[PDB]
Design a protein around this ligand. Sequence first.
Ligand SMILES: Nc1ncnc2c1ncn2[C@@H]1O[C@H](COP(=O)(O)OP(=O)(O)NP(=O)(O)O)[C@@H](O)[C@H]1O
Ligand SMILES: Nc1ncnc2c1ncn2[C@@H]1O[C@H](COP(=O)(O)OP(=O)(O)NP(=O)(O)O)[C@@H](O)[C@H]1O
Ligand SMILES: Nc1ncnc2c1ncn2[C@@H]1O[C@H](COP(=O)(O)OP(=O)(O)NP(=O)(O)O)[C@@H](O)[C@H]1O
Ligand SMILES: [Cl-]
Ligand SMILES: [Mg+2]
Ligand SMILES: [Mg+2]
Ligand SMILES: [Mg+2]
Ligand code: NA
Lengths: 128, 128, 488, 466, 467, 161, 53
Amino acid sequence: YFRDNGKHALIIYDDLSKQAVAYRQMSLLLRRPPGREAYPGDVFYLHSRLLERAAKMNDAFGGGSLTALPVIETQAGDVSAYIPTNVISITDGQIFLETELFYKGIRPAINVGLSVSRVGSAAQTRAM
Amino acid sequence: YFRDNGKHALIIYDDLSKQAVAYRQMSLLLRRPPGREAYPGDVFYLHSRLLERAAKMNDAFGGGSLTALPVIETQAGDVSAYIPTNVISITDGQIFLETELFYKGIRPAINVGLSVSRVGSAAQTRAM
Amino acid sequence: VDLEETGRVLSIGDGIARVHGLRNVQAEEMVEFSSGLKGMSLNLEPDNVGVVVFGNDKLIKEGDIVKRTGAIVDVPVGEELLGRVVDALGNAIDGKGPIGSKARRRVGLKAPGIIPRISVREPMQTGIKAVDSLVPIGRGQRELIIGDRQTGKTSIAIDTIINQKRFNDGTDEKKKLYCIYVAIGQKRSTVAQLVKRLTDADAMKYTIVVSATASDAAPLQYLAPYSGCSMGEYFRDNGKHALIIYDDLSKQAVAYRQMSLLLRRPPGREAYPGDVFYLHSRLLERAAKMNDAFGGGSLTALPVIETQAGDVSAYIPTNVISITDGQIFLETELFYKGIRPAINVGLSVSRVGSAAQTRAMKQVAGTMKLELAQYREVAAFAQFGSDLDAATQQLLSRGVRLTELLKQGQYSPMAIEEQVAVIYAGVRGYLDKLEPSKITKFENAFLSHVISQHQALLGKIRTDGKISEESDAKLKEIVTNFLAGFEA
Amino acid sequence: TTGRIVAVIGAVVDVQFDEGLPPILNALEVQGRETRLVLEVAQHLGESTVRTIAMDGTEGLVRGQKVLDSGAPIRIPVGPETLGRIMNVIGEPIDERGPIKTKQFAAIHAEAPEFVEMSVEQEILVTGIKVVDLLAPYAKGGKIGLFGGAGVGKTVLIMELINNVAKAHGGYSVFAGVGERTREGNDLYHEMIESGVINLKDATSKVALVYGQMNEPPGARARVALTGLTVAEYFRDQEGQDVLLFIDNIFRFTQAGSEVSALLGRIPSAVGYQPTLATDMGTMQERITTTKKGSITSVQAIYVPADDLTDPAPATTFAHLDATTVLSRAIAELGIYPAVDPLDSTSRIMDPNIVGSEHYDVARGVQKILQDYKSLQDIIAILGMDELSEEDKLTVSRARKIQRFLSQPFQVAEVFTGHLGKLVPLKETIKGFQQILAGEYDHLPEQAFYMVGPIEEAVAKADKLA
Amino acid sequence: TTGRIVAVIGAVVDVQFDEGLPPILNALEVQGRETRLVLEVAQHLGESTVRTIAMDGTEGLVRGQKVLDSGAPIRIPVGPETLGRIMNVIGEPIDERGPIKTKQFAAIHAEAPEFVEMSVEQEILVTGIKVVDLLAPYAKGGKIGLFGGAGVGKTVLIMELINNVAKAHGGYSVFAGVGERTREGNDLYHEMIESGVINLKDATSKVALVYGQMNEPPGARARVALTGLTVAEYFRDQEGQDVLLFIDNIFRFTQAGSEVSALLGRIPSAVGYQPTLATDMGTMQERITTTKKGSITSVQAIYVPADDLTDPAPATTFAHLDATTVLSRAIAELGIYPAVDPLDSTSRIMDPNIVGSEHYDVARGVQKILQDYKSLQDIIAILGMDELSEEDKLTVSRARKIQRFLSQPFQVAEVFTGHLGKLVPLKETIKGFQQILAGEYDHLPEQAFYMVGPIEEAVAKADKLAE
Amino acid sequence: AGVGKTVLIMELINNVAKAHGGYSVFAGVGERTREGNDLYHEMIESGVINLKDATSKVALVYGQMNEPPGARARVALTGLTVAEYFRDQEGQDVLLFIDNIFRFTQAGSEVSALLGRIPSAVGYQPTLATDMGTMQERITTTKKGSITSVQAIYVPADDLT
Amino acid sequence: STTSEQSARMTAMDNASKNASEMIDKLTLTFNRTRQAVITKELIEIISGAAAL
Ligand SMILES: Nc1ncnc2c1ncn2[C@@H]1O[C@H](COP(=O)(O)OP(=O)(O)NP(=O)(O)O)[C@@H](O)[C@H]1O
Ligand SMILES: Nc1ncnc2c1ncn2[C@@H]1O[C@H](COP(=O)(O)OP(=O)(O)NP(=O)(O)O)[C@@H](O)[C@H]1O
Ligand SMILES: Nc1ncnc2c1ncn2[C@@H]1O[C@H](COP(=O)(O)OP(=O)(O)NP(=O)(O)O)[C@@H](O)[C@H]1O
Ligand SMILES: [Cl-]
Ligand SMILES: [Mg+2]
Ligand SMILES: [Mg+2]
Ligand SMILES: [Mg+2]
Ligand code: NA
């Protein structure tokens, strides 16, 4: 609504891991053929169609935007798991928060080397 | 009968792994739903019904007893397998036997660190 | 209402036609739809017939007639197939005139029993030193090739075909070997490049190429090894010798799984059917060595299987290992280290053994297979730089330089005598003092020298098929005087 | 003639026909929609009913809704007028530039070229990327596959190959966006307008764009790959021209197949996939090839789910390729970009007869010293580099200097790296790694080789440090 | 009574009867066939219909084709006229030497011997194989099982046991070739004719062959194991004689069950197998036994899919065995043949009261030094040999020599080894591993123990390696 | 057990009943009938249970292991309802001891299987998060009072993930 | 030499303890992911065969 009215919105899905679990529940009760971690084939499509709707519109459409900050919960830092890679493969970068850094006192516990922004520099002020 | 009528008894189930396979065969061919390792949902209900009937009676009902020594064959040391996971949690204690200890010269090959009796000292004489 | 020789399609989808009627149809019988496509009647049920479709199912529709052939699936057979590239049903697909052979043979015939066979003894020379010495193949034997992607599996098969040219230009009929290469699930550009390779070395003239590529339907990929087997079984039963290469049976198993799953047959292990072992067992058993009473011909098989992460202890690899008479296991670790061909010595075996070798090779590579297995055990054991006795450092010194001899390039397979010559130097201990890195240089200089001057000695080993005490003394004089030149 | 919807579930819609049953693969028009909703016939169920896969969302569909037989498969515009234009699965223009006025059309389901039509000539294609050119080089008209896990450099790599080849390549191109990001499509479109390869004023465009991205439902992602081919199949056959065919990402074809197959009600294969994974891939992939009539050089980005190359989707794809550039997260995390595995990447032209014996020896020499270094990784992980012997430490120091010299700054990734983009010729690619193997830079440090073009820059970078 | 075929899906064939419905296990004869085609009734589906499994290939079968009921299960030839001849699953000759000239037949299905029929004798049977005799020796009148993955020496071992034990044996024998290689059937058949164990002319043949190989469909492989043991059951009870019952491979009985299980309308059990694995194995394996009336010494080759001994098939087989010889690919990979796992193979008779304390104490000493070495291997690969104690690297050197002295060149395996075949007596086996344990050959090198018969050959070979 | 687990429970019952004026509840989710006997009589002898007068500081709710999956599934909810009285109706800060919470998950996995629902990853019920969530969200603070809960965690295979 | 040696060993074996410690964490998590995968994948086979009759 804000995107398609020349305004700027921010959305935070907290968290898409729990949503995926809920969709696995619905899928397995429907007796649909499961796969990795018992998830269905469209668990990628679940998140892909959601996060695709976060966009930056042109001036002809109003110049509005919807910015997405989805959340995922990894098990012991495993970024290579099914659902983490699925959402990594959808989004335009990541903010990896490492548990070892949180324990020391580095807070917020952002790993710099692992974290990426794919369209970042363009949307960053000349001062910074 | 021995337990009820004052006396004490000892029972050895050798083994509950093979009993579970027999019960699984029936449950699969009666088309009951197969769970983990193809066993039915009432496989814990099966072994817990059996093992709970072993008991130390008080003086009023007799004073007698029935003592269970069930056996469980693990596969490649996997004590976390479905049927071993059941009978471990049901029972009052475990005597873990391992292949590496057996051929090392530890015979009987009982793991002291992992084996446990939750009753413990209460079933010992002051000498021991 | 005559729905005995004819029948109507109830439903078509994913290559599985369900046919009403056809009361008098047989199991595994070929049938023909309205459009002209062929089908196979694999499921006979009370109210329908499950027919697997050889081709694109767009041509089949509901209410289409299905006529009986009255015959089991069968393919063309004979000498006219040689030099030609065909598909799973023997139809020519190389821009040339069609297959004009008069004889014909069934695809799904059972293998010969105990009495028609005789034990394996005639050598089937691959021209690859690591195979011929360590894991020798005989005529009628079944030797699996196996390993990860790009480990050199097909390359073992190519040289084995190209090595037969030396024999096939001669006049002796029992010396000849007519090859077959069944391509299951590959792409057409790869099979085209493979045929180009054989035609450059003039190998096609005695080679039949059966091509069930990825774009072809699952039944054609399923059928193609059995079709090519029946083309080889013609040579076998009429007193001639043939080779066949199923490249590969993993891609065949995927095709068979698709048919079986879409015929609503409950799948077993890893989604494959219960009878996935039986799929490969009945194919390979047909490759055999016949006795003199049945003409004395043979069919030698070389199936290929793909592994994942170098795991020979997996369900499908172990199935095909449990059928075949040994295997040649390749590894990516050994490949990139320079060990090419990348044959793991311990994991590879041959179950005919020295019975399938010549007497010459039996002398020089008699106890070489086991000695090389112990070398890798001892070399891996003493990786740390500790002191060792003279007997174990000799085993390491020997084993390193034997491995450098068994290295070999491709598109240049060696004759049995020339293999015996180069293996002599290593096993009899002349290489031991030289540096490991110069062993490949030694071999090339030694091989080109014996080809130049000593054609009588190489010829005498080829004629006799052994190393005499005369020839032993000549080689002893040649290598010792050669070694003194190299060491300086 | 006319049909009626009987059931609907996701992308799978069943349609009954009173008279005249439509054959398999025919496009069916749903009557009464704002946009055009195409249903493609997948099966005949029986009792005059056919199962179909929709090319757009099935929301709004009611049982008994009218459906027409188009009388053919999904036909699209193909020709010179497709260049400089974007189109969806069904050939509709999606760039707000009106009709695509072509003279011909073409069905997206054509049978693949027969064995008779196969070319066998393998000519090398110089990329400018060292690991590719050195170890697993591409061939002109060859099938090229870029395997990669989530976020390791597939799209960066395929966009670098567009920059190096497509401009230097005097011929047409095709980019088929199969199930990736719609904003990346916007990035491609407006990059190509600004660069010159697409021209809005003129008709001098060198690229035709096709797009069915991860916002689209499964039936669309499953067919959009084929729509991209059909455009490239015209330029190959009907003009006799050399073609580039970029596809990002061909995994989404097979992923989408898993989504429809579930709803089609089949028994699944291993890892929850469709039982037709290999045959669906075959009929698609065999059309992507260089025939006798014309040349298609095809670069396919291949997503690897959960970094697992043993997964059925990537595992089957290997067979359909002439060169494989296998990316790695392990290599990416250590800073080496592009993150190519030199021991898991292969090419069928890596042959001393084709590339020349000097090339082959330097490639296999690099792979030997890399594989020797890999075998020591269990011992180096625990104790360290210092605990090894003098012979073993020398191979490690060279291998690490090789691994860093295998890295290179890309022109498309100047924002990420910071370094200026480089494109190393084939002569200096062989020469650089040839010197390192001989041991002419054992004295130089490791990080001097990290992110440099030719071997000359490795000496220049090392001198500034001291 | 006459019936009609109603369905054919692979080896599974459904048959409908109007009047007389045949019971389970009954052999049904299919008419209109050139060769004889038996169908054994497995289940009753209902509606006057029964589900069967075919003993030969089903190709050519038509719906409505006539099927007669024999009124009995599969009955095969039994008696001393079977000796020298090769049978198949349904009791026909496959050797081309006329009919099996006997007028007495036995059904392949039968109840296993009762508990009262069981014997408890267990005297040692010395094979001449060092690793087997030392660590996990076999017993006369006892069940022996040869486990192993694909290509580790199960057949090479079982043939060597036939070479060593069966030739020097007064009583009869039976080799049941269940679901393995027709080539190996040919090899055995003509090798026994050479040695005079089978004689084509006179009636002095000791072994009776039975074969249903991997060229056959599942019904054949699922029942040919039973066929073979029914021949041995006659030689046990009716004769009263020591029978040797070799089986290769008894996994194929269970495998053949798993191939058809889906088509019989069963939910699969763990790892794709039938629910009826243990009960089907039980009614078969319990018949393979020694009783009061006669002694059977049964050697059975047991395949292990994917080299995983936890697999339902081999996992269930262990309990049926008195002695177990487990083979490993890991050991065969190093050249150590026979590739027996010394820390996995076991026997019931390994007791100081049965084989004596001097035998027992050496066998455990070998297992200890090998087991202690197995733990070290992984530690000393990283941290190096020089960190070990002098007591440890003594036990490392001794262990590696003991591993090699467990290896042995077989006569049947002469074509693979390149070394002459050797049979080591039990006395010289025990003394050999006694001396190596005590440290009497610590001065001698490592490779002298590899691939030799007695301990004496190590001393001689050690001097040969000097030059 | 054997590290003062049952002693720690009893003291938490004792101390919270004294200071905060809040009673407790014990829910034996898969109680070993032998250990149900021991916990009952140890609570009597200590003082937290009183048999003669009404100064008892715990309600006990046992769903023993020999009972079917339906029993062990819902026995946590039964004891939770006893705590809901003291919170809602009488405004107390209540304790709810659940032993064992893995057996609540396990009993749910058995029930789901029996009904014919297809299992999820590692054999657990597809409704694992909801079955947990519908129970755990009742254990919370309200304006009336609260229900705090000590829960016995069994980690299968020593795997936290 | 020996005062440097004992310092150099104490340093290297402190790193060898930390490296092995992080490898236990990596391997223990890989063990569990494989453990759960084998239980899941085996269960999918049973359900696939059961809902196909
Ligand atoms: N003996 C050899 N010496 C040198 N190079 C070799 C040798 N054998 C194979 N190669 C090379 O290794 C690569 C793979 O060979 P190939 O025979 O295609 O293996 P493959 O396993 O059949 N490939 P694929 O079936 O596609 O996984 C080719 O580029 C060959 O040139
Ligand atoms: N004792 C031995 N000595 C030398 N070589 C051996 C020995 N045992 C096995 N081999 C080698 O390994 C091969 C496999 O032996 P074999 O007995 O056929 O294994 P298997 O376990 O019976 N295979 P399968 O029945 O297919 O599961 C032999 O043909 C030899 O080449
Ligand atoms: N050559 C390179 N130089 C510098 N950075 C790179 C390079 N390649 C990849 N990256 C980094 O990795 C990120 C993701 O790369 P990308 O090209 O999106 O790979 P991908 O596999 O296509 N991603 P996805 O589609 O989400 O799986 C980029 O935004 C860069 O930060
Ligand atoms: Cl003794
Ligand atoms: Mg190949
Ligand atoms: Mg990308
Ligand atoms: Mg065998
Ligand atoms: Na590079």
